[model samples]
Target: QDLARIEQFLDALWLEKNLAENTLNAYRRDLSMMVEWLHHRGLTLATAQSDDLQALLAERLSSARLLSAVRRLFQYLYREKFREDDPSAHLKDLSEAQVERLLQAPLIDQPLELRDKAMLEVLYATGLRVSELVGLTMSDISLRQGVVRVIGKGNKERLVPLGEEAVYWLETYLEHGRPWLLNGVSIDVLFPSQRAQQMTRQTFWHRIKHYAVLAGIDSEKLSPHVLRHAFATHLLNHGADLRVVQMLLSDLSTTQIYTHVATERLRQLHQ
Candidate 1:
């Protein structure tokens, strides 16, 4: 019975949240493991409590990771009317620092050094996710204002400041690099593929990895999202207010995960 509800929740996550296939699969695996553990203890979904959930989580993983999974599961159950009470509500005290060492990792040196450097500079300067960066259009950038209008998650629109250096590189890419890649297509996408369409996420990933190899950085550790992380961390390191940063990111919750990055930067300053 619990398994059926879990499957229904997964379907809702896929359809409602538009979660990527890989993320959905991870949730499915984690929830399935949890249910199996509960079944072994002769428990049913109807009778589980906060303590029982914590006991199941305590068996294999850190509280931080377990709590994240449990919150999602219980939230799903509660929303779907599978359970009246949220058993994971009291597990909120567990927190982990979001200061990933990979954020400070160096870039790779490669043949496309200029392009890779430009990508990193632009992403970090503007706090753009990889998809937004690659999905950019020539029409969205305004060098005069030093701002680029971006459509981020949930299709929300925001204007992000672009540093002078990123503007220069973007201009260079437009005038020199973009023409060669156009292949006679008149697309407005800021970063176009060889086939003239907007660049795919895989393309950005591959390009980042290639440059990671060139910059002597670990390919496995390098990702476009890290650039966003570095952007936030660098801002916080320079004394940007947490609330201001949160507002810029369009996040209302002061207790969001990004605050951990800010807190860690603050801690490092005293050391």
Candidate 2:
């Protein structure tokens, strides 16, 4: 099989530089598999070109191990005269007014419209994960307190405030929109689907895209998590502190990740 050539290559890999055994193992597997893949295409391993190289690289887009493997494989093949060049080289690591536009998208201000408006308002105001936002029960929201009790990942609980705008819309939904949709059937959920089931994440995702397209946003970049980032981002853009943001989400670790997000917004503000 490929044992002799790959083993010989690994033996000589440390001649000029040092690398890991797992790296060599990954290199052996990726290169060996790709070569076999190309062989099935009627191309010999020594004559495999960049197209075959890209076909392999496209499949390994996410793994860190694949990165080293691709680089190692291409570097070795070129040295071995199997490739003319390293196709995997040049591989590299991978807004405020926009919010107002997106918010304005659900502008009809009617029955189901108010529901979407309130949903966006609460999401932007609190940065709740989609699950926490959709999973909210009637008791979890306190209009008088202007906060929501969220059970986020791992059943952890936190009270996230509903700012004035969010509270106002929430009140509007409860007062006007919610009652109409209920059809006289009492439900414990704060936001219910048309069928009276608890609102699910997939529905929200599709609806967000609809609004995103109407708002001229790149729907490709919009998601529940995007709105979540927008929550932290707009807060930071307005000079909100990390500690308060951390308290809203109830987990310091996730807050640290959001810190980088806040930093990006800080740069957009030139703060």
Candidate 3:
């Protein structure tokens, strides 16, 4: 029964959460770890109490991370009607120090120089994700209107204004760089692969990494997503409203995380 419930939970998470493959894999790993711990103790989901679940989690992760993961897991189980009682009902957040430490780790910088610079400028100016940036069509950009129409997550469409700097580079690419690369291939993508095909997410990542090396940015911190992070962080640091940033991001909850990055930047300015 416990195994069946776990399988159900995994399926729901994959189908409903729209979580990325990497994230789903992590959840699978974490849940499997929990299941193994339970099996070693001769406990089944049917026989396990709140205390048993709590003890199992406490033995592995730190109090705060464990509490958060457990709470989310139990919430999912309850929502799915697999669990009658929420075993992690009373789990609270860990200390601020733990959160601070967790967030302090450095990020890998992406390497492609021209591509990385373009990605940074475009994402920062227009608040686009790596996927959206790569997937952009030539028809989606309107230099006259100074806006780019984007198809975001969940297939939602929105128009984002492009700043002068980003526009300038885009125009430069289109006029000189892009034509040279296309070599007569009639592709309409805003950013095309070397073969004049639509750019893939992996190819975009590689281009960003190459540029990061040229830009002298930390290779680890050079991902396309980091540019998006920089966009939100820089905006809020310069006094953009949190709600406005959220709207720009097309996500209400993302403002809180972006604000943390903003706060860190401000702290650096003061220091």
Candidate 4:
């Protein structure tokens, strides 16, 4: 029964995540160890609880690989309704306070600062990838409707809502920042560079790093997708549906990580 479930889980991983053969084999090995440990405790994966896995983790040196494998298995099980709960929901991630500081890092005045502020707000509100954010055209967003149409990977389109704060900042940018940045070029790109062209993903990463330093956050810990992670985890913490967060992130297979993040937050609170 356990092997059958593992096979099914592995198939799902292959079909959905498109993991490579070597990665799949590693996952299989890690999960086999988990299964072996569970069986020794007279428990099956479907029957394992948080305490069971905690005990298992405590016995070992806390291999990040093994934990990720176990988390993915339990996430798949919970997603498929094979289990009522995810045993590996407790894991590490980020802090909301740092995100708040990062979002507020850019100043409110000046065209450049306005652009950066609006970009940060839009990213956090919409949870868009840096590429999607930088690639946004004037036609892609409707401030009146408060939604941004995002064309994600594989040419998939999703309309994500821009919250009130993001809308306000975007409006501010459009009026004060965009025109100055354009310098009479009159381009359609919503957030253009000083050269009035679409901003590259690398350029945006540098921008994020700049603000990270201003926010007093460790720039080394920052990434282009940290806001996206915070978006998913925060929404989950605020009682948003997991599938809805998945849709927002434009990837269902990896949404399980946000569930773990939310669970970790709850664990922190209860401690």
Candidate 5:
């Protein structure tokens, strides 16, 4: 029945908007799969709630096209009075408790565990991108000053302060985890791979995925830049000024996105 409705809706779109056949077919495919996923769980388009749609959205991480199609469908449904609510409005949110759970996910049994804990803490403490986190070198971080110097895009440089919690973990990791992983291999990178070499952004992201599982977070909902988002969002939640966060974030490209994130959070809080 939902598929039939989708087909009729597509027909209406084709008649009124004259979308290309290829584009219509793509929407058909995307909507059909979404419907199938919902059907398995005994739900459909009209009956689906925000959390249900959120699960689907998370499964297709980094797919803006999928989201665009869904948004259009929801807009059509709402505008046509077919549905009373749009489920997509409540997507993309995480609480501080979840972050705390994620940060505590890595137990300090193995050398890599310590490294992961420090990586997560530092990433949360400073709104550093995954690349910046992995790209850190020994000379770039100061445990005493509790700051890390980052060379950002356009080769611009800035110093980001690490909180006391992060500083403690950094110290612990350097003393225990770094030496254990190094095993006499000399490496300048702050966080090294198992072979004591500099880690790539993908490698650290992989670790984050692993820990996300242990942390009981929806792994699909976890993006590579989530820690950075969490860093900015969490700070804003704690009453940090937006300009201060902008200064800390440093990247002009996505600074506006972070600003919206705060507004969105505040909106959510109001409701």
Candidate 6:
């Protein structure tokens, strides 16, 4: 009974959204974590005590998609926080040339390099958020369809396409690179750590920054979040529509944080 309630979301994502097995597990882990967190706190979901949200917040979940899943499971958790603190803050966007350099920074032969290169490729190609990227499982990806299914910003699903280059690297990494790192253990997380565990957001953040420095991109102007900005801005720069960009980013409202650079760039093109 407890388990099926959790599985229902995964079932829906797969059946309705065509999410892969790994993406479903990503949701499963996130919801299970939230439930387990609540269970220890003398709370149960069978009743309507939505007031406990504040408690639910500080403890944290996997991502914003984290809390979004909470709402998907039950209606009590349905709301969005649009604070003045924009997601596209003061940092300058990472340029297309800079992105290419970063993607090229890693050598595909090394185990870690192979993984990082594949990751960097997919991130730029699909524009998935850091959590969505790191949370990726063997199931979220569809190499055949040339698309990666991302569950982002509230358990909402989107199928982001992959470039041919990204697809090539992904296959190579999955085949030659991953098994070398797994050390004889099978893990669900798409890119496994040296110790056979899932990679965390912090660790991924650190690795990308290292790649940025090596790529000769200004380390100071870059962040894990900045890649997302680059993804959005570059898309608009290359003639992708605002509506498409909005959906790609899994936008919740008209108050989009990404509107700043994206629109500014497109507006400049006409000028």
Candidate lDDT scores, in order, read 0.58, 0.63, 0.55, 0.70, 0.70, 0.62
Deviation in Å, model 3, residue 55 alpha carbon: 13
Tens-digit per-residue lDDT, 122-232, candidate 5: 776565667677878999988777678877423556566665677899999988898999998888888999888998877788888788777677877776434555555
The 10-residue segment with the lowest total lDDT in model 1: 92-101
**Which residue ranges in model 4 land beyond 4 Å of their true spot?**
1-93, 234-271
User: Which pairs of residues collide in candidate 4?
Assistant: none
Q: What would the C-alpha RMSD of candidate 2 be, to one decimal place?
A: 15.6
Q: Write the per-residue lDDT of candidate 6 for residues 23-68, one digit (tens) a residue.
A: 6677788678767877777765443245554456556535576655
Ordered from best to worst TM-score, the candidate numbers read 4, 5, 2, 6, 1, 3
| Pairs in clash, predicted candidate 1 | 107-215, 108-214, 108-215, 108-216, 109-214, 109-215
Please give, for residues 1-271, the per-residue lDDT of candidate 1 as tens digits. 6786666556546533366767667777777888888888888776778888878877876456557667877876654334566888887111112222222232323213344455556665555556567767888888666667876434556566565666777666656566767756899887777666776667777866655554455667654334444455554444333434534553221112233433443344334
Please give the TM-score that candidate 3 achieves against the real structure.
Answer: 0.48
> What TM-score do all the candidates reach, one by one?
0.50, 0.54, 0.48, 0.56, 0.55, 0.53
Q: Could you report the Cα RMSD, in angstroms, for every candidate shown?
A: 12.1, 15.6, 13.2, 10.6, 14.3, 12.7
Best by TM-score: 4
| Model 1 misplacement above 4 A | 1-17, 20-116, 153-155, 223-227, 234-271
lDDT of 2 by residue, 23-140 (tens): 6677777667766776787866455566766666676564566667656755665544344556667650005767767777885456577788888887776656555667798999
3 or 5: which has the higher TM-score? 5
TM-score of 1: 0.50
For residues 213-264, what per-residue lDDT tens digits would candidate 3 score against the true structure?
4445555654333344444455443433233443444221122343343444
- Native RMSD of candidate 5 (Å): 14.3
Judged by whole-model lDDT over C-alpha atoms, candidate 2 comes out at 0.63
